[PDB]
Symmetry: C4
Subunit: 25 residues, 4 copies
């Protein structure tokens, strides 16, 4: 398990990547 | 909980994102 | 140890970096 | 504490940011 802040940061990072990909596609 | 280094990295990453957004807006 | 979500996010981030470098090279 | 993989990823991310800043400056 991780600090809740780190979990949130990881989810934001993933969604950032996905939104970038979809924008480019 | 997480390694203090990872917590710091996560906070830096978040603030990086926010500053980028505000710059673009 | 970390939340499985955070581990996945970290691996994705690393591979993102590597693919970017290889693209640029 | 965190998974060693996550710690490494966090350090890489930080150094990535620092190198980017120095390049821009
Ligand atoms: Ca905490
Ligand atoms: Ca932990
Ligand atoms: Ca430590
Ligand atoms: Ca969990
Ligand atoms: Ca492990
Ligand atoms: Cl963690």
């Amino acid at each position: 398990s991780s600090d809740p802040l780190v979990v949130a940061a990881s989810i934001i990072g993933i969604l950032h990547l996905i939104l970038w990909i979809l924008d480019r596609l």
